[PDB]
């Protein structure tokens, strides 16, 4: 496995930008201005800024516009002239945003600073119906501000591991040391590996490029089972093992001769799957069976509800 | 038998239910706190012969396909829980309600009923019972030496002891509000009981939480519109008239078919 | 034999007409019922070839459609703060228990145990309008904005907007009983609009729209239907007796 | 891959212009002036400017006009006499803008300055119906102002990389150095490459023209999976790998013998696709399966909801 | 059985984080603001 | 729920409808095991307290 | 409206009409006439205003 696929650099980080905007067009299906006062107020503000002052007391019952929230992912090392994708979601009671246009919404960070400007055309999917109150604009946002970074300064760079593991950190450190000079990397904890790099942005970039594509074997992580209970999904790791036990579940019985089916000990995932299948049951019954089995032991893995 | 006769039969039954409800409303004038009923009707099956979509040509669409339909099943009877007309009875044991609410009552089974009537009494042990010996809640006991009784408009009940120059507070008579007055199931005796359609009872002192006010010396007359019910009888009678004429027509066609 | 079947098709058409008349007359005094009329159509024609260039004999009759008359019924006053009738075009939208949506021009509304506005049978109206637990008076304006009045608070809190839906074809809807219609491919997609704008009607509170059934029309129609039935039976009897005299030899 | 296809120049940048305007004609289907007061007010303003003063108290119930917002993309190095395309979107309750005409709307930037003038005829598409409240005008806007730029000044030009990557920056720098003289380029971060160019607009233009068409190989980017969840779309990178695991999902079972289907380890995209297909499921079920699998491991890629 | 599968380290520990937020879009089916005052206030 | 909102930073007015149906008040019971360590985890049982119809896919907070 | 021919127009179209809905029960707040009850506790008001 590549270092880039399971590790992230300390200085490289994403940010969240949020903003308010309006979508025009829509062939009707827009917000009901009677129940969405902010839409009309924002439209009046935009008109006044453009040079049109609508009297305060007016009907202003329009249906071709919808108040929306635009969310964007400020990428690491964002440049002033670059563009990013944005997601536009209806705010009021708009029926749909099929062919709407987002108009010059400022995208700000958590500090209330304008970091981007988003404007463009919304694209939405045209019994599993698509979401017509949420669309995506590709390259719809242009960056405006650049975040200062410490990259290129200092002599140590921290590689951060997703799903921290002491064995994973040790393997990464060993691979880095073997590829580069002696003492090039050192694990600080189960999730952080400090790598010594020469001073200079170019040198650090070259070192990171060399390190990222390195091949490191992935050791057995852990015996983990995931039960959704909301999407009816059960997933088992390759490391899961089953201890010998007997399980009885409602309406389930030996094929043949009755309830209390026996579960043979299984050391590998194939054996575990075969035994569970022999203990015939739907995924919903399997979730309860697994919960009870883990409670009683006989299940050498940790099960988590997602 | 004949598809016309079943439809006309349902129509007759619906009009008969209409007249039943009308007569119950109409005889229950002069019944304190009574609430008018009104029947809501509802058409039965529609037996589809040609689907309203179901394009005929490769381009045409066959608008408004053929479907016959039957029946006039009465779906419900709602009860109009509006305020009745207060009238001065000038009796100290009679209390009316201005606004939402119901007096709670404990039935001899122990289950709780709820009545919007104030023609109260005092029994041999002194309790406030309600025209049939149904004890009100929470229990209110008139002392044997009491000479006069008043129910404050907020719901406080205080009697005048003998000798003592002070109307001592003997109890608080509280109302109960339901989110859905209409869903109460009437069990007669001017009582309603909780069903999961009405919602859970919310007991509060009068005035608070939307409850009404207690008017001692008044009685709440039934909200039955006599003129409305009279014209309703005219309408329901002539509807029954017409439906029986339809049954007659079907009978005559069918007997011509037998004679065939 | 031939005349027998064509006269039987006539009898069937008259019976369908009487079924429609009976359903109309029976659903009198149903709020928002639209009277139905049967449109008949003649069947195919046999062409006898002449050695004008031929003649046509024809065979019977066929009920081709039933249209519903989507006029405006007379209002009736009910003193009920929840009942609502419609001035002009439009339908209330309700959500069937399974999850799909039907449409009703019937405004005898109630509130269930959770305060939701339902329709005499328990189907939730759309959009979800929930009365507060301690409501004194409920008002529904002509523009559909439903509001309530609380205790002492001298200002109506707006609690919902009761929209209407209008169709390109009113008649194309199929009725599924219980005063409910559902969209068909002949009706086009619903156009969801606030009352009083874009063609939808206004709302009258405390009134329910009655059936637009004209009973004088139906009594005269029953006269016609009974006489036509007897006439077609006469034709059937005539053909039957002709078949007597045919088989006697 | 060409440098132009994956990199943008520092000085070259687009801007957003917005403006208000009116569309005439439309064969009816215009805004309802009763519910759109700003339409009538703007029409009266235009008439007064042209020399006609309508009395304040008047009916003015017209249906052949629609108030619209016009959006344009101010291109880099925009010249005064050039023309740009514009997008016109209905603002009020107009039914359609089929054959409308946009009349002399000023397009302004975020600084409230008029940068273009837009006027022309709207073109709109003539069960998937087209958007009739939004149209496009080709060459409908003529520029009026020119943005000052620093291009041609200094000796360093920053190439900005879309979807920053240390390996990508290193590859770009190496290619630039190999093509040009030694030390011609230097990576400053995962997204920026500083290139030394001779002073002078012509020299910089020649250098940029030479650099842009250069061929640079694209190294493996990352194991990324994209799930829309709104358009029912799932996309997997060529770098995605699947770890051995067992998955059980509602109504899904072994073809054959029951639930808990086994997923064999797959190193390449073809193997991953074959295993997932063998674990037969629709895309909606596949999204949940992928989420649970990633939660439990067994999925050597990062999945993002779009 | 592996030590990791049946043992946990003293220093390694998980924590729970909670927060309030809003979800936009939904094609309707959102909160009834009449009965959910906090949604409109937020 | 109002206490939690106020703690998080949202103060709902005292007089409000607040008629919600996506939450249920519950009692959570757990078995503190012998020699329990600070970082360890245990299983819990959640039982409805009021009139909640079901807790099919709920989240304990 | 509803022009029949190209040149005729059909003035005063046919519409039936229904109902006598009582729109309101307006309450007229005029000043009453004051009379000497000669009781100390009974005070009347002269003009606009109400007791809270």
Short mmCIF file of N, CA and C in Angstrom, two decimals, chain A residues 27-28 58-64, chain C residues 191 193 196-200, chain D residues 20 22-23 26-41 59-67 90-97 133:
data_model
loop_
_atom_site.label_atom_id
_atom_site.label_comp_id
_atom_site.label_asym_id
_atom_site.label_seq_id
_atom_site.Cartn_x
_atom_site.Cartn_y
_atom_site.Cartn_z
N UNK A 27 -37.89 27.59 -13.76
CA UNK A 27 -39.21 27.37 -14.34
C UNK A 27 -40.25 27.18 -13.25
N UNK A 28 -40.41 28.22 -12.43
CA UNK A 28 -41.20 28.05 -11.23
C UNK A 28 -40.46 27.17 -10.24
N UNK A 58 -44.66 46.13 -0.57
CA UNK A 58 -44.95 45.61 -1.90
C UNK A 58 -45.28 44.13 -1.79
N UNK A 59 -45.92 43.61 -2.83
CA UNK A 59 -46.28 42.19 -2.85
C UNK A 59 -45.04 41.31 -2.96
N UNK A 60 -44.29 41.46 -4.06
CA UNK A 60 -43.07 40.70 -4.30
C UNK A 60 -43.30 39.20 -4.07
N UNK A 61 -44.20 38.65 -4.87
CA UNK A 61 -44.54 37.23 -4.83
C UNK A 61 -43.95 36.58 -6.08
N UNK A 62 -42.69 36.16 -5.98
CA UNK A 62 -41.97 35.55 -7.09
C UNK A 62 -41.77 34.07 -6.83
N UNK A 63 -41.60 33.31 -7.91
CA UNK A 63 -41.48 31.86 -7.83
C UNK A 63 -40.37 31.30 -8.71
N UNK A 64 -39.51 32.15 -9.28
CA UNK A 64 -38.41 31.70 -10.12
C UNK A 64 -37.06 31.76 -9.42
N UNK C 191 -49.74 21.03 -10.65
CA UNK C 191 -49.15 22.36 -10.57
C UNK C 191 -49.49 22.90 -9.19
N UNK C 193 -49.73 25.39 -6.37
CA UNK C 193 -49.77 26.84 -6.28
C UNK C 193 -50.52 27.28 -5.04
N UNK C 196 -55.51 31.47 -5.17
CA UNK C 196 -55.79 32.80 -5.67
C UNK C 196 -54.80 33.35 -6.66
N UNK C 197 -53.69 32.67 -6.89
CA UNK C 197 -52.72 33.08 -7.89
C UNK C 197 -52.56 31.96 -8.90
N UNK C 198 -52.25 32.34 -10.14
CA UNK C 198 -51.89 31.38 -11.18
C UNK C 198 -53.02 30.40 -11.48
N UNK C 199 -54.26 30.84 -11.30
CA UNK C 199 -55.42 30.09 -11.73
C UNK C 199 -56.12 29.29 -10.65
N UNK C 200 -55.46 29.03 -9.53
CA UNK C 200 -56.12 28.30 -8.47
C UNK C 200 -57.20 29.17 -7.83
N UNK D 20 -28.65 43.29 -13.85
CA UNK D 20 -30.10 43.21 -13.94
C UNK D 20 -30.55 43.73 -15.30
N UNK D 22 -34.00 43.47 -18.56
CA UNK D 22 -35.36 43.15 -18.95
C UNK D 22 -35.35 42.43 -20.29
N UNK D 23 -36.30 41.51 -20.46
CA UNK D 23 -36.47 40.75 -21.69
C UNK D 23 -37.83 41.09 -22.27
N UNK D 26 -41.57 37.56 -25.89
CA UNK D 26 -41.94 36.38 -25.11
C UNK D 26 -43.32 35.84 -25.48
N UNK D 27 -44.08 36.49 -26.35
CA UNK D 27 -45.44 36.07 -26.67
C UNK D 27 -46.22 35.76 -25.39
N UNK D 28 -46.37 36.79 -24.56
CA UNK D 28 -46.88 36.55 -23.23
C UNK D 28 -45.85 35.81 -22.40
N UNK D 29 -46.34 35.04 -21.43
CA UNK D 29 -45.49 34.24 -20.55
C UNK D 29 -44.51 35.08 -19.74
N UNK D 30 -44.70 36.39 -19.70
CA UNK D 30 -43.82 37.26 -18.96
C UNK D 30 -44.18 37.33 -17.49
N UNK D 31 -43.46 38.19 -16.78
CA UNK D 31 -43.69 38.35 -15.35
C UNK D 31 -45.07 38.93 -15.09
N UNK D 32 -45.68 38.49 -13.98
CA UNK D 32 -46.92 39.08 -13.50
C UNK D 32 -46.57 40.35 -12.74
N UNK D 33 -46.80 41.50 -13.37
CA UNK D 33 -46.36 42.76 -12.78
C UNK D 33 -47.02 43.02 -11.43
N UNK D 34 -48.20 42.44 -11.19
CA UNK D 34 -48.85 42.62 -9.90
C UNK D 34 -48.01 42.03 -8.78
N UNK D 35 -47.43 40.85 -9.00
CA UNK D 35 -46.60 40.19 -8.01
C UNK D 35 -45.11 40.50 -8.17
N UNK D 36 -44.74 41.24 -9.22
CA UNK D 36 -43.34 41.60 -9.48
C UNK D 36 -43.25 43.11 -9.63
N UNK D 37 -43.28 43.84 -8.52
CA UNK D 37 -43.24 45.31 -8.61
C UNK D 37 -41.98 45.85 -9.27
N UNK D 38 -40.84 45.19 -9.09
CA UNK D 38 -39.59 45.73 -9.62
C UNK D 38 -39.58 45.76 -11.14
N UNK D 39 -40.30 44.84 -11.79
CA UNK D 39 -40.35 44.84 -13.25
C UNK D 39 -40.97 46.13 -13.77
N UNK D 40 -42.14 46.50 -13.23
CA UNK D 40 -42.80 47.73 -13.67
C UNK D 40 -41.98 48.96 -13.33
N UNK D 41 -41.36 48.97 -12.15
CA UNK D 41 -40.54 50.12 -11.76
C UNK D 41 -39.35 50.29 -12.70
N UNK D 59 -52.10 51.52 -14.09
CA UNK D 59 -52.25 50.06 -14.04
C UNK D 59 -50.94 49.37 -14.39
N UNK D 60 -50.44 49.58 -15.61
CA UNK D 60 -49.19 49.00 -16.08
C UNK D 60 -49.16 47.49 -15.81
N UNK D 61 -50.11 46.79 -16.42
CA UNK D 61 -50.22 45.34 -16.31
C UNK D 61 -49.79 44.75 -17.65
N UNK D 62 -48.49 44.52 -17.80
CA UNK D 62 -47.92 43.98 -19.02
C UNK D 62 -47.46 42.55 -18.81
N UNK D 63 -47.39 41.79 -19.90
CA UNK D 63 -47.05 40.37 -19.84
C UNK D 63 -46.06 39.95 -20.92
N UNK D 64 -45.46 40.90 -21.64
CA UNK D 64 -44.49 40.59 -22.69
C UNK D 64 -43.06 40.86 -22.26
N UNK D 65 -42.82 41.13 -20.97
CA UNK D 65 -41.50 41.45 -20.46
C UNK D 65 -41.25 40.65 -19.20
N UNK D 66 -39.97 40.39 -18.91
CA UNK D 66 -39.60 39.64 -17.72
C UNK D 66 -38.31 40.19 -17.15
N UNK D 67 -38.30 40.45 -15.84
CA UNK D 67 -37.09 40.89 -15.17
C UNK D 67 -36.13 39.71 -15.02
N UNK D 90 -34.61 34.08 -15.47
CA UNK D 90 -35.79 34.80 -15.02
C UNK D 90 -35.70 35.10 -13.53
N UNK D 91 -36.17 36.28 -13.15
CA UNK D 91 -36.11 36.75 -11.77
C UNK D 91 -37.44 36.66 -11.03
N UNK D 92 -38.54 37.03 -11.68
CA UNK D 92 -39.83 37.06 -11.00
C UNK D 92 -40.63 35.79 -11.17
N UNK D 93 -41.79 35.90 -11.82
CA UNK D 93 -42.67 34.76 -12.06
C UNK D 93 -42.89 34.52 -13.55
N UNK D 94 -41.95 34.94 -14.39
CA UNK D 94 -42.11 34.77 -15.83
C UNK D 94 -42.26 33.29 -16.18
N UNK D 95 -43.20 33.00 -17.07
CA UNK D 95 -43.43 31.62 -17.47
C UNK D 95 -42.30 31.09 -18.34
N UNK D 96 -41.83 31.89 -19.30
CA UNK D 96 -40.78 31.43 -20.20
C UNK D 96 -40.10 32.64 -20.83
N UNK D 97 -38.91 32.39 -21.37
CA UNK D 97 -38.11 33.37 -22.11
C UNK D 97 -37.73 32.81 -23.47
N UNK D 133 -36.93 29.10 -18.53
CA UNK D 133 -36.69 30.32 -17.77
C UNK D 133 -35.21 30.67 -17.71
#
